[PDB]
Write a protein that binds this ligand. Sequence first.
Ligand code: BCL
Ligand code: BCL
Ligand code: BCL
Ligand code: BCL
Ligand code: BCL
Ligand code: BCL
Ligand code: G2O
Ligand code: SF4
Ligand code: SF4
Ligand SMILES: [Ca+2]
Lengths: 100, 110, 360, 51, 52, 52, 645
Amino acid sequence: GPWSGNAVHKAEKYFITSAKRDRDGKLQIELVPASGRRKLSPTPEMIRRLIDGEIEIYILTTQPDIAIDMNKEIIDMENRYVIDFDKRGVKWTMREIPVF
Amino acid sequence: PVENKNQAPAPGKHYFIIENLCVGCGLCLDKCPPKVNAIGYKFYGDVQEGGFRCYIDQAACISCSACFSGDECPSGALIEVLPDGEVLDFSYTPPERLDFDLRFLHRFHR
Amino acid sequence: NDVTTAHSDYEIVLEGGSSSWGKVKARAKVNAPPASPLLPADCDVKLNVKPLDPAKGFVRISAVFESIVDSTKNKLTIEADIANETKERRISVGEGMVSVGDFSHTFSFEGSVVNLFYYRSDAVRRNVPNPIYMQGRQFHDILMKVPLDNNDLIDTWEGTVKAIGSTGAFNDWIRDFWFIGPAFTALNEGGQRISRIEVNGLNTESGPKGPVGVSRWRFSHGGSGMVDSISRWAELFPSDKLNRPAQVEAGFRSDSQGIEVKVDGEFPGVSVDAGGGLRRILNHPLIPLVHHGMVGKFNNFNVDAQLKVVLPKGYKIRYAAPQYRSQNLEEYRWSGGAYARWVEHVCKGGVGQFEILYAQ
Amino acid sequence: LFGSNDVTTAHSDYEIVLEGGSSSWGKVKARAKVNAPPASPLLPADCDVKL
Amino acid sequence: QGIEVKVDGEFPGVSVDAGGGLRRILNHPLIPLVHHGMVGKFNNFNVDAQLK
Amino acid sequence: VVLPKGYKIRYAAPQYRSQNLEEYRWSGGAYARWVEHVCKGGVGQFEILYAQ
Amino acid sequence: STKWYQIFDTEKLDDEQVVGGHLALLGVLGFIMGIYYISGIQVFPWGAPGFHDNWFYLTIKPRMVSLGIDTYSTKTADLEAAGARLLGWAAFHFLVGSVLIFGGWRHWTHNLTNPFTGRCGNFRDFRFLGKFGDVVFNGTSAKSYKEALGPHAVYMSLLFLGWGIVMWAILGFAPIPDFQTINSETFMSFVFAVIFFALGIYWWNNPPNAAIHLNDDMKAAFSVHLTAIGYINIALGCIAFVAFQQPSFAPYYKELDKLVFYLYGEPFNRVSFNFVEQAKEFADFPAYAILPKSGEAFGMARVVTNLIVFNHIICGVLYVFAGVYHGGQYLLKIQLNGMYNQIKSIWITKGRDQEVQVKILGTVMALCFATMLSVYAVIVWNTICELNIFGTNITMSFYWLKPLPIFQWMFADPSINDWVMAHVITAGSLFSLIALVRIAFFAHTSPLWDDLGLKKNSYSFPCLGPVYGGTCGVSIQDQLWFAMLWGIKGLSAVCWYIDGAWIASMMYGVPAADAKAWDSIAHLHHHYTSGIFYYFWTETVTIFSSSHLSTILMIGHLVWFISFAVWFEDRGSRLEGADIQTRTIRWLGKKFLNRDVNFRFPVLTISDSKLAGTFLYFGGTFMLVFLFLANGFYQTNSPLPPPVS
Ligand code: BCL
Ligand code: BCL
Ligand code: BCL
Ligand code: BCL
Ligand code: BCL
Ligand code: BCL
Ligand code: G2O
Ligand code: SF4
Ligand code: SF4
Ligand SMILES: [Ca+2]
């Protein structure tokens, strides 16, 4: 179980690259697993996996913010973004360079 | 009859760190050359509750890749972005496997 | 005396940087008899590639097959210019000479190979990180000219003229002629299906010193994914990666007592970026594996194999399957164990993978 | 002495529980562990089939 | 390094009636055997097999 | 192999193990290798040439 | 990070390299054995005295007596014959060891050329001998460890047959099946030669398959063989303790008590401040000469038996711990490499499921806790009753608790002491097994580190920081150190039991009343030397009497409380202190040096600090336990009377 795949992640960690908001919304939002060999698209089957809990997609910070107000605009702590508006999504924070 | 000659001796970059995932162990600091000093501790609160994390100064950090190639991160916060944009928690993650156990009926493990 | 064992040494010296440009040195000896009704069977093959012009993209390849079978010497030399016109269509202009015994004929050829994959889905390439089985079809169109400078050769051309003009089923039996003997089996064991050919032209114009027979013909190789020529067409032709004249010598001598093989040579394309930042030593082409298993299944053997992958400094192997036994801090060594089982696997026709992933 | 050394090992168990009478039903439970390498060009292959 | 196969099943066509009042376990389909033969001849092996 | 009288084996794929007058016997290692070769489908030769 | 203890790591060594190392070690061991044999020459063949009874030779001696060497003779001529045989066999060992070192160097250089015949012998393919190799194997094991077990067993059979031959010809022991007398070890050597030849040919024709080791044999096979041979060494220690106590070995061990020894460092006759050698206590012996120590009072038979038994026992326990640690290192390697999911064998697949690991470790922990609590409560209650605090006499103690009559066969005098010894051994075994199982299963991720998203990425990483207020010592190396510290208690129990001590109570034999009445109420014909705490007081009498043992005492104590400095959580304090030291050493500038002091004061890494701490901890502890076993047996077969009738 844990030894299969990356041992840190309970669910498959799918980071979201900065594919965004450059051509009719850029529906081909780039989802990349922790393995990183493949580069998938956000098809409804990936959403089925994500709601199944087997995978979990995460937004990074140090990049052009990915449709940050067009995907979802809940900004209570700036990290309340959800895809199907009832997702309970989690954002990865990186104040890498802006902090001392 | 005739054959040709043979010889055969065989026989006889822009690395980032996710502070949400980072736990503040600082092996990146040990893996960084002292002349650069890219890895640095940032303190948030009580040390025993996670407290300080680590950060990279992008301008100072110039494509050494020692941190990630060392593969010393326990938390997987040390990430590498690629020119095409893929992100790597680890250099080589083990493959995901469909796990289900084996029990022979007549063997002693049944 | 009853024990048959295979002794093999392998050395893969990769070079630093994005370009692989690796050197392969392989020695092999096996006590099992060869699967050849003509013995002894000795062969020397020299393949040298030279960059004719990087701006034009033209490369030049010379292959010299020298062989001795049953005390008879055969020699197929061929110099050719390969040029990648498009990612599907490729052109070739070359000249060569086949000298068997006292007989010898020189040939010239213009040839267009159009390789089209059946499925160009972005879904497959998006999901699968390592595409192995890629179906497709290669259309070869070859115009080959041979001086009819020999009476027996003239007889061959005349008889072939009548054969083409007499039988309408010739396009099916020409495959039987072309796939002489076990070759016709091998194409079925490797997923290769060959369509009936189409003879566009069959004519003769005469040069001042002798007549020239010109034959233009097309055929359609068809790969069901297992074929290296189709599935690895891009990995086939690393012309962009080639700036230095590369070359490989390969000689195998087959007496009934044993088989001795030596393959020494450098060439590009050994390692390709598999994604995820790890360079992979290229996947094994499966056509060699199955075609060699065809003859390797015929006998059992003990395995004594040793592979020595010489990484360039600063690079480390992150994945090996099976694991390396010993490491010299730059050279990774696979000797015995599950590597021996994998060597048995591939000798007998196994298409199992040996993932060597290495990175900075 | 013997030939064809350095062989791998495969351990297999099978059970066919038949049903009496006109019922031709059976319960097949099979297990196998083979130490030979697989013939998969993409080797790490695990498939579960629920029919 | 290996292959690990586990089959649990309940099949309604295991037993086939034969002449003379005899019933038998069904003849093995040959496509499985032959299609397994391609991969089964790739290594030399010894089998420890039990059947109940 | 029993030849016609007055003939001898000159060239041979792996040589004869034993030779009585007029009788040649192939056995041992290499001939067994060839037999194992042809049992499994090997098309290798066993070129036995005999001359007066 | 390749350290000075990683240069000889197996990952950099090949099969031929380790063959050469093993042969060099065998030759060096032969040279050391020659040293010891020379050290056992009591009277020189020249016509002069000899060496003063080294502990090494005092251990080696009874085995030599079993052979035709080393007569237990006070007669000078026969003792000179003993010295002659010892010296001759030492020279033979020297020659054979020199040849073995030469072969080891040849295999280390991968330069195998025979001087007489200019040919190169391939390590991968050869014949074992000119005709014998073709008779048996017809070739070589094809570079796979599983295929080598056959030839290895054949070589062991050859060695057994050679040992029988040597006993038959040189040492003059004719094989007969009488196992009470010495001259059956050669008959059993021949029997073992037959048995192991059969096993070797079977394993050559049919190689056993545990495909885990073959790939990275350098660590997997190393770990498996090391743990197996550690258990073998523990079994050998147990067998040695049983046998050396048997009457059959008595002519070769009890006679060691009959004869006296002049040991190196044993107290000498003390001269006064004014001894005119042109006052001296014990004037019959010469000045500054070693006073004889009588074996009967010293119990030299059981002292040598204890040295042998505990040497093998602790070596076996250490080998078990190292096997588990190296197996954990290999498991971590395959876990980072992704091969952990691909092993396909029972020795891994059973532990692949983390819940099975949890169940196994929880069962071990529960058994350890239950047994430890039971035995410790028994011990402390016995101590309370014998010291009579809270108004409890020893009638309330666990004196009734004897081993079961069915289980009483394996004890001399059934008592609570044997019960507590067995329970303490089981409890300590499970106590160390907790950490051994942690190494085995949690090399990469513990269930806590599965829940909390961290993973162990190295065999020698210090920790993961102060996150969660912890993370200290989760490396398999640190778990090995904890396992060693936990097994220190078990090894101490073993040593104290074999030396003779009341483990069932703490202060047995002290001037308290019910401590002395233990023997009266227990009905024991053996008077155990003393209780756990009183053991030091009773057995340091000789350690203080002997200057050499006192020197060892001091050095071991220094080593231990120097281990303290690197064991504690103080590495950062030591680093800043070392920076202050460096700054003041730079302040030696302007002290008229004119020399740039480029000397940074070094402080060990935590992964190195724990290494040094455990090494010094174990070293001091068991340098002192050597004195425990070298104080003497001092067990008198006389029950104690009650202080009050
Ligand atoms: C082998 C499996 C396929 C095949 C697949 C390919 C591939 C693949 C290529 C061609 C190409 C060519 N094919 Mg074709 N082709 C086959 C059968 C044929 C037949 C025939 C009647 O048998 C003919 C007449 C042709 C005709 C031709 C030419 C038009 C053209 C150049 C040949 C040349 O230079 O060879 C010179 C002779 C050789 C070099 C001899 C050795 C050939 C082997 C296959 C080389 C293996 C290289 C080795 C693994 C690594 C070497 C390292 C060295 C440094 C280079 N093909 C079969 C059906 N064909 C090329 C092209 O597209 O041209 C436009 C090309 O890329
Ligand atoms: C005319 C032939 C074709 C062609 C056909 C093929 C085929 C088909 C294959 C390759 C393969 C390879 N080719 Mg090519 N290739 C062509 C052009 C090139 C050129 C070039 C710029 O001219 C170069 C540098 C290469 C280089 C390479 C490598 C990237 C790769 C082998 C990897 C390895 O480690 O091999 C290890 C090296 C060897 C074992 C040495 C072999 C040496 C012998 C003399 C040649 C093979 C003989 C063969 C068994 C028998 C041929 C008999 C026929 C009757 C002619 N090719 C030409 C145009 N090449 C393989 C690969 O993986 O493709 C992705 C593959 O399947
Ligand atoms: C009971 C027999 C044991 C055993 C007992 C020993 C002993 C004892 C020694 C070795 C040594 C080594 N063994 Mg071992 N070893 C066993 C099984 C194995 C297996 C296996 C089955 O897979 C392997 C691959 C090895 C491999 C190795 C290497 C790490 C090394 C020899 C090669 C070299 O040149 O070293 C290069 C270096 C040298 C040969 C000498 C370096 C200098 C000194 C002599 C090292 C001493 C270390 C230490 C103090 C030994 C103490 C033993 C304790 C007192 C109990 N061992 C069996 C089961 N092995 C030696 C080694 O170096 O240990 C680290 C060593 O000391
Ligand atoms: C000091 C004794 C050392 C030793 C010292 C040497 C020396 C010195 C040399 C070799 C040579 C060789 N050694 Mg050695 N070697 C030892 C044990 C081993 C073992 C093992 C059994 O584990 C292996 C795998 C090897 C490997 C090898 C061979 C590849 C090679 C001989 C080729 C052959 O056909 O020779 C046939 C015979 C062998 C395989 C010998 C096997 C080992 C025997 C037990 C000892 C031989 C040397 C000894 C002093 C002579 C008397 C032996 C008694 C009659 C038993 N050695 C023993 C323990 N070995 C020789 C060489 O390279 O030859 C060309 C060489 O010069
Ligand atoms: C081997 C490395 C060193 C060496 C180091 C030692 C050591 C260390 C010791 C001796 C001791 C002995 N040595 Mg020496 N000695 C060497 C070379 C030799 C040679 C020789 C020609 O090679 C000979 C004849 C001897 C002779 C002897 C005897 C005088 C004496 C008792 C042997 C005996 O009981 O073995 C018993 C023989 C066997 C059991 C059979 C052969 C070995 C088998 C095949 C291996 C398994 C058994 C193993 C030893 C124990 C493991 C038991 C487990 C249950 C598996 N030495 C080389 C140079 N020697 C002993 C000593 O002095 O005792 C006080 C002793 O302990
Ligand atoms: C029994 C013979 C050997 C043995 C042979 C092997 C072999 C062979 C392998 C290991 C390997 C390992 N060994 Mg071991 N090992 C033994 C003793 C030990 C002890 C110990 C103190 O008892 C420990 C803690 C270890 C530790 C370890 C681990 C590092 C690793 C297994 C991890 C795993 O997931 O296990 C999962 C746990 C199990 C499968 C436990 C169950 C064991 C068996 C298979 C089932 C029947 C036994 C039953 C439970 C107990 C009662 C009957 C017994 C006969 C007494 N070994 C003894 C000395 N060990 C493997 C490794 O990778 O090495 C580097 C490996 O290849
Ligand atoms: C014999 C035993 C010990 C020493 C010898 C010693 C030496 C020493 N140590 Mg120590 N130590 C413990 C025992 C010993 N620590 C214990 C049991 C603990 C557990 C709590 C412990 C813990 C800490 C912490 C946390 C810190 C230190 C330091 C610090 C020093 C810096 C300068 C100084 O204090 O000199 C004062 C000390 C000296 C005069 C020591 C040198 C001769 C000596 C008189 C006796 C000589 C003994 C001989 C060297 C042994 C072998 C000889 C031969 C075989 C080679 C420094 C010389 C630290 C600093 O660098 O600053 C202080 C720091 O932060 N410690
Ligand atoms: S990549 Fe180089 S500069 Fe950047 S943090 Fe790592 S070691 Fe420092
Ligand atoms: S190694 Fe990982 S956990 Fe440690 S400081 Fe670096 S990013 Fe943080
Ligand atoms: Ca004592």
